[PDB]
Amino acid sequence: PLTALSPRRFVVLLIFSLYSLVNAFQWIQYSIISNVFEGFYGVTLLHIDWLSMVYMLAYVPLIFPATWLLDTRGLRLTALLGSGLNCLGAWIKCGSVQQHLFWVTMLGQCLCSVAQVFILGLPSRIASVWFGPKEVSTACATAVLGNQLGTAVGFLLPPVLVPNTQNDTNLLACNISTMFYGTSAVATLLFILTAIAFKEKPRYPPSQAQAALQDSPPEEYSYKKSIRNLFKNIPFVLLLITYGIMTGAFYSVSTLLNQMILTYYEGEEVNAGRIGLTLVVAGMVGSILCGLWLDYTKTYKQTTLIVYILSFIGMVIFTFTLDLRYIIIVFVTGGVLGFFMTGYLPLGFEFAVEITYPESEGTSSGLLNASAQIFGILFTLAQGKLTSDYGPKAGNIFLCVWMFIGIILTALIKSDLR
Ligand SMILES: CC(C)CCC[C@@H](C)[C@H]1CC[C@H]2[C@@H]3CC=C4C[C@@H](OC(=O)CCC(=O)O)CC[C@]4(C)[C@H]3CC[C@]12C
Ligand SMILES: CC(C)CCC[C@@H](C)[C@H]1CC[C@H]2[C@@H]3CC=C4C[C@@H](OC(=O)CCC(=O)O)CC[C@]4(C)[C@H]3CC[C@]12C
Ligand SMILES: CC(C)CCC[C@@H](C)[C@H]1CC[C@H]2[C@@H]3CC=C4C[C@@H](OC(=O)CCC(=O)O)CC[C@]4(C)[C@H]3CC[C@]12C
Ligand SMILES: C[N+](C)(C)CCO
Numbered sequence: 001p002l003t004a005l006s007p008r009r010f011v012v013l014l015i016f017s018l019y020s021l022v023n024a025f026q027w028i029q030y031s032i033i034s035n036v037f038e039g040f041y042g043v044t045l046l047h048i049d050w051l052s053m054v055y056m057l058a059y060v061p062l063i064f065p066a067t068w069l070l071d072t073r074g075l076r077l078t079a080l081l082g083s084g085l086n087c088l089g090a091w092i093k094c095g096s097v098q099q100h101l102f103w104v105t106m107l108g109q110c111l112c113s114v115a116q117v118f119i120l121g122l123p124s125r126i127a128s129v130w131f132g133p134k135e136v137s138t139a140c141a142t143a144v145l146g147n148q149l150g151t152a153v154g155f156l157l158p159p160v161l162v163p164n165t166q167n168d169t170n171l172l173a174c175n176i177s178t179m180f181y182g183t184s185a186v187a188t189l190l191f192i193l194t195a196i197a198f199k200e201k202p203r204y205p206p207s208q209a210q211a212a213l214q215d216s217p218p219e220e221y222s223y224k225k226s227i228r229n230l231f232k233n234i235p236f237v238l239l240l241i242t243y244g245i246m247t248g249a250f251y252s253v254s255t256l257l258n259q260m261i262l263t264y265y266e267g268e269e270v271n272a273g274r275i276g277l278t279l280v281v282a283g284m285v286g287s288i289l290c291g292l293w294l295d296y297t298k299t300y301k302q303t304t305l306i307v308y309i310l311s312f313i314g315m316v317i318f319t320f321t322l323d324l325r326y327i328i329i330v331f332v333t334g335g336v337l338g339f340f341m342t343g344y345l346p347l348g349f350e351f352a353v354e355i356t357y358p359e360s361e362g363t364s365s366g367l368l369n370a371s372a373q374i375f376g377i378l379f380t381l382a383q384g385k386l387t388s389d390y391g392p393k394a395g396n397i398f399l400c401v402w403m404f405i406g407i408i409l410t411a412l413i414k415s416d417l418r
Contacts, residue, residue, distance in 0.1 A: 005206060009130035016119075019082065020122070021149055026089065026154070026183060027151065058110065076199065078118045079118075082119045086119075089111030089112035090180065090183045093109070097180065124361065126143065145287075149280075226360060230367060235355055239351055243345070243371065244372050250376075252379035260387065275331055282338040308410050314336045
């Protein structure tokens with residue numbers, strides 16, 4: 001048919017990549033300065049850990065209903081839901097700046113968590129709907145890098161924005177209010193932009209395949225049947241477990257970074273945020289490089305196993321170098337660990353998608369993300385308890401053992417797939 005490329009696609013790609021980014025920020029704003037919020041609200045570190053774990057807890061039950069809603073009602077409703085929920089959560093947080101109003105900020109974080117469910121799976125759908133065959137992969141990569149950059153900014157900003165001033169509660173409240181109001185204003189602007197500009201689909205089909213998909217009549221899809229068939233697929237299950245372990249380890253490290261660093265270095269919250277930013281940026285660079293390598297070679301199993309082993313080595317090095325009382329070595333080890341660990345996620349995701357070619361990409365993506373969230377919750381809880389009881393090294397060694405198990409599982413996966 002007659003297919004054309006619409007300029008609005010770029011706007012559609014930009015606005016999403018922005019508000020998704022904001023969501024990622026709101027995920028890690030509390031954790032990076034978790035000590036400050038713990039002092040302000042008079043709560044335990046477990047409360048701040050739950051502020052991060054609410055995202056993971058909310059994603060798992062709502063992912064598949066969200067997928068059904070996206071399929072039935074289109075892209076515009078999902079985008080509006082995500083942006084509006086993020087803005088509402090930010091506004092709720094804005095009113096939670098008091099020593100006795102932790103539940104209000106928890107409600108706001110829950111709103112942002114529910115928003116996330118409408119955002120994570122949107123990249124591929126937007127790229128297919130609005131971009132031609134050559135630009136689909138680049139658009140999806142940019143969309144995911146948006147969330148990764150949001151996590152990096154969530155690492156970097158809060159430490160600078162909110163200094164640790166427990167002596168002066170009023171100054172702490174003022175700084176927290178400034179951060180919350182800035183985030184809420186950005187979220188409101190992004191929601192307004194999404195409402196004004198975001199559209200269901202371009203007037204022409206971006207690609208011949210998308211044109212055929214539009215022409216093809218809708219077909220009922222049974223998510224339960226697809227999930228059952230996927231679970232019958234043993235290599236897919238193994239890859240799911242390994243990817244979940246890796247992503248949960250990343251989530252736990254991100255959430256507990258402040259607790260680990262503050263144990264050995266005092267008054268280094270800004271440097272903790274910088275270390276998190278270095279981890280995320282090295283992860284993005286490694287993701288790009290590993291994507292190029294896999295596209296050039298297409299060796300799913302070999303590259304996956306090698307990257308898993310290197311990530312385990314980096315995690316062990318970080319574990320046994322954290323307490324050296326030198327922050328530069330912490331920077332370097334965090335950079336290497338982020339490189340290898342985060343560069344793995346796209347590789348494993350593509351391997352899982354290819355392994356389950358007959359099955360829909362949406363179901364496999366949702367299962368992978370749900371496994372990641374579950375492993376993140378488990379690792380966060382266990383590692384936080386271990387760090388509190390015995391010290392960061394215990395939880396780090398626990399993560400090392402889980403990464404070793406993940407390597408063993410990855411090696412077990414049997415597939416000649418390219
Ligand atoms: C609507 C969707 C997003 C689900 C919402 C779920 C949350 C509202 C729940 C899930 C788990 C809950 C947490 C589970 C465990 C704890 C530990 C609990 O700690 C104690 O009671 C002991 C505190 C101390 O050590 O003094 C305080 C509540 C809290 C943070 C809970 C707060 C509410 C949470 C985050
Ligand atoms: C990675 C390992 C460690 C955990 C894997 C757990 C999964 C098997 C769970 C996680 C989320 C679950 C889903 C969450 C919500 C729903 C919606 C629920 O919808 C209904 O009740 C109606 C379905 C219909 O219309 O038939 C059906 C089960 C399902 C797909 C669940 C099936 C089981 C899932 C995929
Ligand atoms: C796949 C899953 C089921 C494996 C789970 C294994 C855990 C139970 C292991 C992993 C890391 C272990 C911890 C690693 C290091 C330590 C420090 C150790 O410290 C000591 O008191 C002795 C050493 C010293 O003097 O420092 C006490 C045990 C503990 C908490 C270990 C307890 C057992 C842990 C949590
Ligand atoms: C996708 N994030 C890393 C932003 C949240 C995990 O729950």
